Design a protein around this nucleic acid. Structure first.
Ligand SMILES: [Mg+2]
Ligand SMILES: [Mg+2]
Ligand SMILES: [Mg+2]
Ligand SMILES: [Mg+2]
Ligand SMILES: [Mg+2]
Ligand SMILES: [Mg+2]
Ligand SMILES: [Mg+2]
Ligand SMILES: [Mg+2]
Ligand SMILES: [Mg+2]
Ligand SMILES: [Mg+2]
Ligand SMILES: [Mg+2]
Ligand SMILES: [Mg+2]
Ligand SMILES: [Mg+2]
Ligand SMILES: [Mg+2]
Ligand SMILES: [Mg+2]
Ligand SMILES: [Mg+2]
Ligand SMILES: [Mg+2]
Ligand SMILES: [Mg+2]
Ligand SMILES: [Mg+2]
Ligand SMILES: [Mg+2]
Ligand SMILES: [Mg+2]
Ligand SMILES: [Mg+2]
Ligand SMILES: [Mg+2]
Ligand SMILES: [Mg+2]
Ligand SMILES: [Mg+2]
Ligand SMILES: [Mg+2]
Ligand SMILES: [Mg+2]
Ligand SMILES: [Mg+2]
Ligand SMILES: [Mg+2]
Ligand SMILES: [Mg+2]
Ligand SMILES: [Mg+2]
Ligand SMILES: [Mg+2]
Ligand SMILES: [Mg+2]
Ligand SMILES: [Mg+2]
Ligand SMILES: [Mg+2]
Ligand SMILES: [Mg+2]
Ligand SMILES: [Mg+2]
Ligand SMILES: [Mg+2]
Ligand SMILES: [Mg+2]
Ligand SMILES: [Mg+2]
Ligand SMILES: [Mg+2]
Ligand SMILES: [Mg+2]
Ligand SMILES: [Mg+2]
Ligand SMILES: [Mg+2]
Ligand SMILES: [Mg+2]
Ligand SMILES: [Mg+2]
Lengths: 98, 71, 171, 53, 59, 94, 108
RNA sequence: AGGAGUGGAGCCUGCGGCUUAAUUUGACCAACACGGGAAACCUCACCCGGCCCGGACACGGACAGGAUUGACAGAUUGAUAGCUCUUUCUCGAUUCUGUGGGUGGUGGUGCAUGGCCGUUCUUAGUUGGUGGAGCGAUUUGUCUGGUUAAUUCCGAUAACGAACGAGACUCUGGCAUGCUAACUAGUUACGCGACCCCCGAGCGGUCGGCGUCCCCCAACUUCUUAGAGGGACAAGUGGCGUUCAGCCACCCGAGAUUGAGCAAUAACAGGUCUGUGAUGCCCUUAGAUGUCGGGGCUGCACGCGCGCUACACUGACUGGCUCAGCGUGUGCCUACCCUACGCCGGCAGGCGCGGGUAACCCGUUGAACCCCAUUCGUGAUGGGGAUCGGGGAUUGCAAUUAUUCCCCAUGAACGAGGAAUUCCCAGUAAGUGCGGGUCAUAAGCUUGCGUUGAUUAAGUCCCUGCCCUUUGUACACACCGCCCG
RNA sequence: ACACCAUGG
C-alpha cells in the first residue's frame, strides 16, 4: 500500500488544521515529529505531499534539507470536500493582519 | 556505467493465487451454522478471524509471527 | 533545556539561525523585492523585521502570507507557539541596496530583454538615487556557444584595504 | 516487505553529513557547526566570522 | 574562535589557507539591592544586539 | 554471536546425515570472521572469496584461527614486462 | 610530446574503449612503410596493397607510427586506395588474433 | 658568503608501471602527505551475488464471492529476504495492468556554463573626458633629469583636470609604577593564628627565617585581565643634495627598517559537473547508473616525489633537579565530552566516587631539549631499531590482509651519502616538545604555540627570471615562431 | 677585452 487510510487522514487533517506543513528531506526517520508523531513515519508525509502538489492544491519550497508546503485555495476546497467539514469552516488562517 | 548482462531467472512476483471467496462457514440445518476452522484465540485478533488449516498445522493469519500449532 | 549550552556554541548557533533564516526568505520573497532580514530578541519574545521593497505583496490580502511565514518559521525552528513575531518593513532609497538591484535586474533579464538595455537601466537607476559609483558584471553564454563577460562601470569604486567592508555593497 | 533496510550508522563518516548541502567528505565539527568545508566559506560572514589575521 | 580552511573548492592550486576568527567579549557588574529596581532598570535601555543575563545572587 | 548460530546448526545436522566412513558435503557461507570452535572440526565448509566459495576441510590445527584466514581474496602477482611509462626515460612518441 | 600545448582538450581515453570488428567493405591491414604527404602504404590480410590515406578525423591526433595493426575502409569503385578508420592497441591486436578475427599471418 | 640540507640507507606516504573479478577516479614552475582523500563496515563512485520502488499525475482496463498487502511451517538461500516453490490464513479500494509522461543519478561533457580558486605577477602597473598631431591603425597626457619600497615625489611641460592600483586603512607585537577597577586575578601588610626548625640576637618565645598553611567586613592595582586616551614625526643636531624631493651618521628613546590581512586593468580553452535542492545538452530509468552481505581502493620484478628515524663520545643508558605559551572540553538528529582523588594490576588497563556548559574543575597546565651525578670505551659496540616468534588489554556489530596499545624475545641496511638540487637575513635557520583539524579507536600529515638559540650579508647583475626606454624582425597559434635544400 | 648553445604534434 502507499500508506494506510488512517495515516492519510491523520496527515490531511493536520495540514488543514494549521494550513502549512514541514518535514526534513529524510526517508529513514521512524516518526515524523509534530502532531503526526504518535503514528506516522515522515516518509509517508513526504510521499503524500508530493501527490498533493502534483494536483495543484499546494505550493512547495525547499531550503537546507526542509520542505515548506502552503495550502492554496484549491487545497482548501478539496480538503473541505475530502474531510466532509461544515462547508464554511477554516481554522487555518482567519484574521485581518495589520 | 556500461551495458548489462543477460539474466535467465527473471520472475518479478508470485502471481497471488485467486480464490472464490468464502466457504469456511457451513449452513447445516435451516438456520443453523457450523464452523469448519476455529477463530484464533489471540487477544488482539477479534475472534472473527479464521485460523488456517494446513495438512498438519494450524496457523493464525493475523498473528504475523505467532500462533502456529503442530497438529 | 535541562543544562544550557556553553557561550561558544550559543553564539555559533545564533549565527547559524540568522543565516538559515535569510537563505530561506531569499527564496520566497525573491520576486517581492526582498533585501534581507533583521532579528531582535526581547524578554520572552522574538521579533523578525523582514525588509522588502514592496510590503503590499509580502503581507498579502488580509495578510495571509505573513501568517503562513510565521507558521513555518515557528514549526521548523520549534519556537513555542506564541513566541515568534514577524513584521514587514519598507526599504528607504531602494536604489542603494545591491541585493534588490540584482534581483530586479534578474527578473528583468528573465522576461526577455537584451542584456545591454537592462544593465544600462540598472546603472542609471542606482546612480540617480545617489551613489558615488556602481559596477555591474554579467557573465555566461552570451550570444553563442562560447562564454563571455560584460562589465558596466560608472563613477568611483574601491577594491583594496579596509574601507571595502563599508562603503561597498555587493551581491 | 523488508526488515533489512539499515545496519548500524552510529559513528564514522556514515553517521554525519552537512546541514546545508547534505554531503559528507570534509565537514567542520568544531563548535558544533557540522558544515561542509566549501559551504562554510559561503556563510562564514552571516555567522559572524570575519577574516582579519 | 579560530577556523582555518583551504581556500580552493577542489584540490588544485598553490596551497593557500583562510584564517577565520570570531571574538567574544564578556564582563560582569555586581549590585547590592532589592530585586525589583534591578530587574526594572535592566529591562530598560537596551536597543542593539547584546546579551544580558541576570541571576539571583553571587556572593 | 547473534544469528552466527546458523553456521553452527547447519554445520551439525550435516555431520550427522554423513554416512559412516565418508564426509559431509559443503555448508557454504559469507561469515569470514568465525572463531573456529572444537565443535566445528571435521566439517566441510565453503568460504566466500568475494566471488567463489572455496572449500576448506577443517583440521584440528585450525583451532582458534579465523575462517577467512583460509580463503585468500586475490591472485598472487607475477609480473609482465614494464610498459611505456615505467621509467622516467621511457616517455616519447612522435 | 612535452610542449607548451596544454591547450587542446586532455586525453580522457580511460573511459570504456570497446572492441571493433569488420563490416562490408572494411578489413584489417598492417603497416609496411610510411610515405610523405600523410598517406602511407599498407598491406591487408589477404594480399592487396591499397596505398592508404589518413582520414581527416585522425590528422595530428592518433599517430599511426610504422608497423602496427590498422582498420581500413575500402572504396565501392576503386581498390588500390583505402582510408584508415582506426588504430588498435597491442591489447586489441592480441584480442582479435585470439578471437579468431585477424589471420595467423602477420606479426606485431 | 655561509648554515641546515635533499639526492645515498631502513621505514611511512602520494604518483606511474605491472597484476587482478576489481585493484574506482581527478591533477602531470602553476600535478605527486593535493581532492581537507589517516578507505577495516559505512564512506564508495569499482568487482561478485541478492531484496526494494521510494514509477508523481492523467487517460483506459480490471474490482466488493472483491483491486490489492502481509505471513507460520517444510524446501531453497550467506541469510530468520514470504526471495522463489508446496501450503492457506490474513489485509479491504491506499493498490495492480497498459499507454503518455515524471523522478533520481559520486552517470558523461570543466572544450557548453554560473560561482569559487589558482596562475600570468609581488611586481608597479592600468584607463576614460575636453584639447594637440596623423587619411588611418594609433599617439601625447603616462616625460630628458634627480629621488623613492613604489607611475612615490620634485620638477620639466601640447596638455588641463580626474579615476583605480601603491600609500592611507584593519588586526597584531613592542612602552606607560599616569586613568578606569576587579572574592571567576592578585600583592603587601598585619588581625591573625598554626606548623617547623634554631637557622641567626635570644633560649626554645620575643628579634628574625620557610608557607600555593587558614583567615580579614585590612590597603591598594606594581604583577594578571581589558577598555579610553598618550607616544614616532625623518621631529633635533652634523654632513651630502642644482640646497628642492630626499640620503647618510649621531643624540634622547620602550622603538628611528615588527608580522600579517586587503589589492588594479586584461586574461588562461588553468582546476572543479565527485561541495551544492547552482545548472544546458546527451545517457540510463524496474533485468537500473536510485539498497543489503562479501571483496577492492593496502595487491609488487621496477622508476620518481613530499617526509620520519639514524650512522654516535658536542653521545647512549640509569637516577636526581627545575622552567611555558596558543587551545579545546558533556553533541540540538547525531547520542560521544575533559578529568581530579581513592583502590586494584609490573604495564596497557579495571573498578569507585566528585568537579566542569568553563579566568570558577582538569591546572600553579611539575612538557621535552637543556641542567647536575653514575655505567660504557672507537668495537656495527650498550650506536641504529628494520624484520620476525610467543603472550596480555582497550574501541567496535566485526580487528584475518596483523586498527591502536603493553611485555619478553629476534637484532637488517646504515661508518656522513655520485651527477645534481631545495629553503633561508634576527628572536630568523636549526634543535625541542605541546595544543587544533580528521577523530567509535588514532599521526611518520598539516595548521598554530612557545622553549634553547648561531655561523655568514648589508651586495651585485654573473646565472634563472622580472620592470622601464631606445633599437631590429620575413614572428602575431607570437622563438615551444618562421623556414632552405 | 669572443670554446661549445641544434630541433619542435
Ligand atoms: Mg586606493
Ligand atoms: Mg596596501
Ligand atoms: Mg634530516
Ligand atoms: Mg603506520
Ligand atoms: Mg593505483
Ligand atoms: Mg592525465
Ligand atoms: Mg610564479
Ligand atoms: Mg573526492
Ligand atoms: Mg567499502
Ligand atoms: Mg535529472
Ligand atoms: Mg548530484
Ligand atoms: Mg576551464
Ligand atoms: Mg570557470
Ligand atoms: Mg582626441
Ligand atoms: Mg583629426
Ligand atoms: Mg600612451
Ligand atoms: Mg633606488
Ligand atoms: Mg595629471
Ligand atoms: Mg602598527
Ligand atoms: Mg600584550
Ligand atoms: Mg600563594
Ligand atoms: Mg590603544
Ligand atoms: Mg637638515
Ligand atoms: Mg639610548
Ligand atoms: Mg609594515
Ligand atoms: Mg593584480
Ligand atoms: Mg562545480
Ligand atoms: Mg550536469
Ligand atoms: Mg543508499
Ligand atoms: Mg557495501
Ligand atoms: Mg589511494
Ligand atoms: Mg606538495
Ligand atoms: Mg585506517
Ligand atoms: Mg602537531
Ligand atoms: Mg580525540
Ligand atoms: Mg589527535
Ligand atoms: Mg591528510
Ligand atoms: Mg622600473
Ligand atoms: Mg619597434
Ligand atoms: Mg615592430
Ligand atoms: Mg603572419
Ligand atoms: Mg605551428
Ligand atoms: Mg627554434
Ligand atoms: Mg633552445
Ligand atoms: Mg629533425
Ligand atoms: Mg626537419
Amino acid at each position: 500500500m502507499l500508506m494506510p487510510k488512517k495515516n492519510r487522514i491523520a496527515i490531511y487533517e493536520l495540514l488543514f488544521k494549521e494550513g502549512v506543513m514541514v518535514a526534513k528531506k529524510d526517508v529513514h526517520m521512524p516518526k515524523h515529529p509534530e502532531l503526526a508523531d504518535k503514528n506516522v513515519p515522515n516518509l509517508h508525509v513526504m510521499k503524500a505531499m508530493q501527490s498533493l502538489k502534483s494536483r495543484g492544491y499546494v505550493k512547495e519550497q525547499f531550503a537546507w534539507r526542509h520542505f515548506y508546503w502552503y495550502l492554496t485555495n484549491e487545497g482548501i476546497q478539496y480538503l473541505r470536500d475530502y474531510l466532509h467539514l461544515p462547508p464554511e469552516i477554516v481554522p487555518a488562517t482567519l484574521r485581518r493582519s495589520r | 556505467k556500461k551495458s548489462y548482462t543477460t539474466p535467465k531467472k527473471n520472475k518479478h512476483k508470485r502471481k497471488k493465487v485467486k480464490l472464490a471467496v468464502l466457504k469456511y462457514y457451513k449452513v447445516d440445518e435451516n438456520g443453523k451454522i457450523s464452523r469448519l476452522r476455529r477463530e484464533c484465540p489471540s487477544d488482539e485478533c477479534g475472534a472473527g478471524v479464521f485460523m488456517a488449516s494446513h495438512f498438519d498445522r494450524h496457523y493464525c493469519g493475523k498473528c504475523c509471527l505467532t500462533y502456529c500449532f503442530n497438529k | 533545556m535541562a543544562v544550557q549550552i556553553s557561550k561558544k556554541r550559543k553564539f555559533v548557533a545564533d549565527g547559524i539561525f540568522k543565516a538559515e533564516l535569510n537563505e530561506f526568505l531569499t527564496r520566497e520573497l525573491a520576486e517581492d523585492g526582498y533585501s534581507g532580514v533583521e532579528v531582535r530578541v526581547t524578554p520572552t519574545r522574538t521579533e523578525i523585521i523582514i525588509l522588502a521593497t514592496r510590503t503590499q505583496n509580502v503581507l498579502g490580502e488580509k495578510g495571509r502570507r505573513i501568517r503562513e511565514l510565521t507558521a513555518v518559521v515557528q514549526k521548523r525552528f520549534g519556537f513555542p507557539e506564541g513566541s515568534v513575531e514577524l513584521y514587514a518593513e519598507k526599504v528607504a532609497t531602494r536604489g542603494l541596496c545591491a541585493i534588490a538591484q540584482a534581483e530586479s535586474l534578474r527578473y528583468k533579464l528573465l522576461g526577455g530583454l537584451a542584456v545591454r538595455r537592462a544593465c544600462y537601466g540598472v546603472l542609471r537607476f542606482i546612480m540617480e538615487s545617489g551613489a558615488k559609483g556602481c559596477e555591474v558584471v554579467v557573465s555566461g553564454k552570451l550570444r553563442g556557444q562560447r562564454a563571455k563577460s560584460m562589465k558596466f562601470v560608472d563613477g568611483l569604486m574601491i577594491h583594496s584595504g579596509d574601507p571595502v567592508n563599508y562603503y561597498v555593497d555587493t551581491a | 516487505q523488508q526488515l533489512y533496510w539499515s545496519h548500524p550508522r552510529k559513528f564514522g563518516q556514515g553517521s554525519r553529513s552537512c546541514r546545508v548541502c547534505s554531503n559528507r567528505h570534509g565537514l567542520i565539527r568544531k563548535y558544533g557547526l557540522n558544515m561542509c568545508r566549501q559551504c562554510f566559506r559561503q556563510y562564514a560572514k552571516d555567522i559572524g566570522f570575519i577574516k582579519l589575521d | 574562535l579560530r577556523i582555518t580552511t583551504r581556500k580552493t573548492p577542489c584540490g588544485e592550486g598553490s596551497k593557500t589557507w583562510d584564517r577565520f576568527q570570531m571574538r567574544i567579549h564578556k564582563r560582569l557588574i555586581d549590585l547590592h539591592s532589592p530585586s525589583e529596581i534591578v530587574k526594572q532598570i535592566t529591562s530598560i535601555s537596551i536597543e542593539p544586539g547584546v546579551e544580558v543575563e541576570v541571576t539571583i545572587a553571587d556572593a | 554471536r547473534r544469528k552466527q548460530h546458523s553456521l553452527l546448526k547447519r554445520l551439525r545436522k550435516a555431520k550427522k546425515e554423513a554416512p559412516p566412513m565418508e564426509k559431509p558435503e559443503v555448508v557454504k557461507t559469507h561469515l569470514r570472521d568465525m572463531i573456529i570452535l572444537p565443535e566445528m572440526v571435521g566439517s566441510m565448509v565453503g568460504v566466500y572469496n568475494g566471488k567463489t566459495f572455496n572449500q576448506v576441510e577443517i583440521k584440528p590445527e585450525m583451532i582458534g584461527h579465523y575462517l577467512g584466514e583460509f580463503s585468500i581474496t586475490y591472485k598472487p602477482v607475477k609480473h609482465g614486462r614494464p610498459g611505456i611509462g615505467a621509467t622516467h626515460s621511457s616517455r616519447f612518441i612522435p | 610530446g612535452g610542449k607548451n600545448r596544454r591547450r587542446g582538450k586532455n586525453e580522457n581515453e580511460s573511459e570504456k574503449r570497446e572492441l571493433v570488428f569488420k563490416e562490408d567493405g572494411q578489413e584489417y591491414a598492417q603497416v609496411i612503410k610510411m610515405l610523405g604527404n600523410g598517406r602511407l602504404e599498407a598491406m591487408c590480410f589477404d594480399g592487396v596493397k591499397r596505398l592508404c590515406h589518413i582520414r581527416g578525423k585522425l590528422r595530428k591526433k592518433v599517430w599511426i607510427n610504422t608497423s602496427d595493426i590498422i582498420l581500413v575502409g575500402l572504396r565501392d569503385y576503386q581498390d588500390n586506395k583505402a582510408d584508415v578508420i582506426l588504430k588498435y592497441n597491442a591489447d586489441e591486436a592480441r584480442s582479435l588474433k585470439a578471437y579468431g578475427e585477424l589471420p595467423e599471418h602477420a606479426k606485431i
